[PDB]
Structures are given as structure tokens and as C-alpha cells.
Structure 1
Amino acid sequence: STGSATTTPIDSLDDAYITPVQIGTPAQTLNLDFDTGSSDLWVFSSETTASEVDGQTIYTPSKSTTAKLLSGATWSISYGDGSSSSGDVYTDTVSVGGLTVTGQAVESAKKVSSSFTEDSTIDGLLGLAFSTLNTVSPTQQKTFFDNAKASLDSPVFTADLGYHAPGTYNFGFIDTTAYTGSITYTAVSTKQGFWEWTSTGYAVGSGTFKSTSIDGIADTGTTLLYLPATVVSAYWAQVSGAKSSSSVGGYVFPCSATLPSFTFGVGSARIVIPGDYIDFGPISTGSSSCFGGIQSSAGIGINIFGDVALKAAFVVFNGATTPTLGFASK
């Protein structure tokens, strides 16, 4: 089998991407944030505290003839931005872009943090990291991808995120028309449960390439690119007036600037992030200060190749027995 679904930026800055997902019988379609940095599929639901729901579409298991309570199972998660959610668990039929999984754990939120409530466009998350990170207790559950894997033509999924435009998540096949040149594959460590890999270095604009190992994760659920402070300082030093602001919470730059590109290494190959991709707009409406798309990972504990990096590439998440990651230009 295969699946293919369009993913769409939630706003004009690509702050996140949502993908329609069919849950239950008859189908209930929710727009979920596909997140290769976590491993829970959770949704706003008929069980979510009323004051914490504001415009989201909810999953109502009582209206699904294929829903079953996963008795005694609960879940609780907190993400890197400090947001969180928790609740109980059902199993149900879940389809993405034509690909159907029966008995998928669908985690129903009873509580969500304010950042989720405040975002009316995201109805939940669909985790695509390794199932060892799944938070369901006392019986850990498999991701949608993990459940689908044996039935897929090939045990892979691909992320083709657009810049200020829709993109595509494919399951079970590689669309050779979706990228240019060849795909460079690189080793993955699953030791922390992430799609963790090592970049071979970087360049700023037209500068010389710096060969240096940068360990990080490929995370579709993170908006920006988080790299070591040395790397991030070297980038913003090429932008007149750019500075790190503790009050704002990262590097800002004059909205009048033309941003240089940023290149990262994948083996001997190079992925170029155009300068415009690194612009996340006025820090507040009308401000002449703009927020940068490359930020320091120093206070995170891990480097994160988020959407700013990934949208510059066609990315293959290879879930074979020995997992790997592939990057192509497009």
C-alpha cells in the first residue's frame, strides 16, 4: 500500500503545517500537525475541557462505530516549547492520504496547554518519531507509521514541505519527480528515539564551507533551525544590525535586511536554504525588527533541523531495519 497527503502552512509564515487525517467510521477529518520529533497521535476531542477548546475540530469517539476504549491507558506529553497535553486512549481506524491503519491508538485529550487552545488551526499531532518515545501508559503504543510499515510497498515516508506553499507527505514510496539530482542518505541513530543524524558542516551565503560534525534531529514539528551558538553567530554576523535579544528570545534582524543563504552538509552533498526562508517576519505587527529562522540550540540540549531546514529539501525517512535519512535538493 501507499498514501499521499497534502500538507498546508497554517499561516503566512509557515509557523507549522497541517495535514488532513481521517479518523473513525464514518470518517471524522481532523487537521493534524505531522511531527517527526514525537511519537503520539493525539487529538482535540469530545473529552477535552470545554474552556480549553477554541475553534478546533474535535474527535468524538461515541460517533465512531469502529472506536474502542483502550481500557486503562492514559497519556501525558510535554514538548520542547513548554506546551503539553494529556488524556485517555481509544483505538480506531485512521487514514492518511488513502493509506489506512486499523487499530491505531488515538489519544484523546482531556487537557491541553494554552498554546494549543490558542491555535485554532491545529486539531492535534501525529507523531512520526520512533515508537519508543510514545507516552501511553501502561502499554506503550505504536505510531501510525510503525503500524503501517509492514503493509507499505516500501518501509518509508517522505516530507516535501513547501516555502509559503503547500507540500506533500508520502507513505510507502519515493516520488522521483519531486526532487532534482540524487538523494544522499545518511546514518540514523535511534538511541534517543529521534531521527538523529550528523551533518557534515555548513556555509554562510557564498562563504567557504566549514567541515564540522553537527549532530541533530530531523523534526517536522519544529518551525525553526536550531544550531550551536558558534554556527548561529557566524550566520547572523553577516547581517547588518542583527543581534540576539533576551527580551525577544533569540536573534532578530532589521526588516530592511537581505538575508544570506545557509548551506548544510549531508555527507558530501549540500542543501542550500535560501535567505528568504530564514525570515519569520516582524516580531510584533508593524515592528521594524524581524525574527530570525536560525536560532541557537544552546538552551535545548540538542540541535534541531526543523522546517526552515527541511523545507529546502526532499527528505526521506527510511524506516528499514537499519533506519536512514535521505536528503535531495528540489
Structure 2
Amino acid sequence: STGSATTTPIDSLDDAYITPVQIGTPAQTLNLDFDTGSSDLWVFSSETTASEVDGQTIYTPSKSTTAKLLSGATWSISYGDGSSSSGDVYTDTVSVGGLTVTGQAVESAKKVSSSFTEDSTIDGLLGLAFSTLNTVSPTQQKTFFDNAKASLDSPVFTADLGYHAPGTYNFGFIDTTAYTGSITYTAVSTKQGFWEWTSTGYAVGSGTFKSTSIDGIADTGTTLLYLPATVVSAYWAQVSGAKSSSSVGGYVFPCSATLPSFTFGVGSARIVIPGDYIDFGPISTGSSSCFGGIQSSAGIGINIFGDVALKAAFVVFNGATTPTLGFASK
């Protein structure tokens, strides 16, 4: 089997992407944030504290003929941005882009933090990291990908995120029309439960490529590119007037600037992020200070190849016995 679903930016900045997901019988379609940096499929629901729901579409298990309470199971998750959610668990039928899994754990939120409530466009998360990170207790649950894998034509999914435009998540096949040149595959460590890999270096604009190992994770659920402070300083030093602002919480730059591109290495291959991808616009409405899309990881504990980086590539998440990542230009 295969599946193919379109993923759409939630706003004009590409702050996250939402993908429609069918849950239950008859189908309830919710727009979920596919997150290769976490491993829980959780939704706004009929159980979510009413004051914490503001415009989201909810899953109502009582209206699904295939929903089962997963008795005794609870979940609770905290993300790298400080947001959180928790609740109880149902199993139900879940379909993405025509690919169906029966018996998927659907984590129903009883509580969500303010950033979730305030974002009416995201009805929940669909985690695509390794199932070792799933938070359900006392019986850990599998991701949608892990449950689908044995049915798939090839044990893979691909992320093809758009810049200011829709893109695609495919499951079970690699669309050879969706990229240019060849795919370069690189090793993955699953030790921390992430799609963790090592980039071979970077370049800023037209500058020389610096060969250097940068461990990090491929994370579709993180908006920006978080890299070591040395790398980030080298990038923003090429933008007149850019500076790190502790009041704003990272690098800012004059909105009048033209940003240089940023290149990262994948083995002997190179992925180029156009400068435009690194502009996240005015810090507050009407400001002439703009927020940068490349930020320091130093206060995180891991480097994160988030959407800024991933959207410049066609990315293969190879879930074979030995997992690998692939990157192609597009």
C-alpha cells in the first residue's frame, strides 16, 4: 500500500504545516501537524477542557463506531518550545492520503497549553519519530508509520515541504518526479529516538564550504534551523545590522536586508537554502526588525534541521531495519 497527502502552510510565514487526517468511522477529518521530532498522535477532542478549545476541529470518539477506549492508558508530552498536552487514549482507524491503519492509538487531549489553544489551525500532532519516544503509559504505543510499515510497498515516508506553498507527505514510495538529480543517503542514529544524522558542513552565501561534522535531527515539527553558535554567528555576520537580541530571543536583522543563502552538506552533496527562506518577517507588526530563520541551538542541547532546512529538499525517511535519511535538491 501507499498514501499521499498534501501538506499546507498554516500562515504566510510557513510557521508549521497541516495535513488532513481521517480518524474514525464515519471519518472525522482533522488537520494535524506531522512531526518527525515526536512520536505521539494526539488530537483536540470532545474531552479537551472547553476553555482550551478555540476554533480547532475536535475528534469525538463517541461518534466513531470503530473507536475503543484503551483502558488505563494516559499520555503527557512537553515540546522543545515549552508547549504541552496530556490526556487519555482511544484506538481507532486512521487514514492519511488513502493509507489506512486500524487500531492506531489516538491520544485524546484533556489539557493543552496556551500555544495550542491560541493556534486554531492545528487540530493535533501526528508524530513520525521512533516509537521509543511515545509517551503513552503504561503500555507505549506505536506511531502511524510504525503501524503502517509492514503494509507499505517500501518502508519509507517522504517529506516535500513547500516554501510559501503546499507540499506533500508520501508513505510507501519515493516519487522520482518530485526531486532533481539523485538522493544522497546518510546514516541515522536512533539512540535518542530521533531521525538523528550528521551533516558534513556548511557554507554562507557564495563563500567557501566549511567541512565540519554537525550532528542534528530532521524535525518537520520545528519551524527554524537551529545550529551551533559558531555557524550561526558566521551566517549573520554577512548581514549588515544583524544582531542577537536577548529581548526578542535570537538573531534579528533589518527588514531592508537581502539575506544570503545557507548551504548544508549531506555526504558529498549540498542542499542550498535560499536567503528568502531565512526571512521570518517583522518581529511585531509594522517593525523594521525582522526575525531570522537560522538560530543558535546552544540553549537546546541538540541541533535541529527544522522546516527552514527541510523545505529546501526532498527528504526520505527510510524506516528499513537500518534506518537512513535521504536528501535531494528539488
| TM-superposition CA deviations, 1:15-61 (whole Å, max 9, x none) | 00000000000000000000000000000000000000000000000
**What SS is found at the alignment partner of 2:194?**
coil
Unaligned 5+ runs, structure 2: none
**What SS is found at the alignment partner of 1:94?**
strand
Q: Which residue of 1 aligns with 2:29?
A: 29
| TM-superposition CA deviations, 1:208-232 (whole Å, max 9, x none) | 0000000000000000000000000
Instruction: Give 1:193 deviation, angstroms.
Output: 0.1
* Aligned pairs (5 A) from 1:204-243: 204-243=204-243
CA–CA separation in structure 1 for the residues paired with 2:250 and 2:16: 19
Instruction: Give 1:160 deviation, angstroms.
Output: 0.1
Instruction: Give 1:276 deviation, angstroms.
Output: 0.0
Verify: 1:285 aligned to 2:295, yes or no.
no
CA–CA separation in structure 1 for the residues paired with 2:299 and 2:148: 35
Instruction: Give 1:147 deviation, angstroms.
Output: 0.1
Instruction: Give 1:85 deviation, angstroms.
Output: 0.1
Normalising by structure 2, report the TM-score. 1.00
**What SS is found at the alignment partner of 1:150?**
helix
**What SS is found at the alignment partner of 1:240?**
coil
CA–CA separation in structure 2 for the residues paired with 1:307 and 1:113: 22
**What SS is found at the alignment partner of 2:151?**
coil
Q: Which residue of 2 aligns with 1:260?
A: 260
| TM-superposition CA deviations, 1:292-319 (whole Å, max 9, x none) | 0000000000000000000000000000
CA–CA separation in structure 2 for the residues paired with 1:244 and 1:65: 53
Instruction: Give 1:174 deviation, angstroms.
Output: 0.1
CA–CA separation in structure 1 for the residues paired with 2:185 and 2:113: 37
Q: Which residue of 2 aligns with 1:194?
A: 194
CA–CA separation in structure 2 for the residues paired with 1:188 and 1:230: 24
CA–CA separation in structure 1 for the residues paired with 2:281 and 2:101: 39
| TM-superposition CA deviations, 1:109-162 (whole Å, max 9, x none) | 000000000000000000000000000000000000000000000000000000
CA–CA separation in structure 2 for the residues paired with 1:59 and 1:213: 43
* Aligned pairs (5 A) from 1:91-110: 91-110=91-110
Question: Percent identity between the aligned chains?
Answer: 100
CA–CA separation in structure 1 for the residues paired with 2:39 and 2:101: 16
CA–CA separation in structure 1 for the residues paired with 2:18 and 2:128: 14
CA–CA separation in structure 2 for the residues paired with 1:315 and 1:219: 11
Instruction: Give 1:71 deviation, angstroms.
Output: 0.2
| TM-superposition CA deviations, 1:196-247 (whole Å, max 9, x none) | 0000000000000000000000000000000000000000000000000000
Instruction: Give 1:90 deviation, angstroms.
Output: 0.0
Instruction: Give 1:187 deviation, angstroms.
Output: 0.1
CA–CA separation in structure 2 for the residues paired with 1:107 and 1:116: 15
Report the number of matched residues.
330
CA–CA separation in structure 2 for the residues paired with 1:5 and 1:219: 18
Instruction: Give 1:107 deviation, angstroms.
Output: 0.1
CA–CA separation in structure 2 for the residues paired with 1:98 and 1:189: 30
CA–CA separation in structure 2 for the residues paired with 1:286 and 1:34: 31
Instruction: Give 1:252 deviation, angstroms.
Output: 0.2
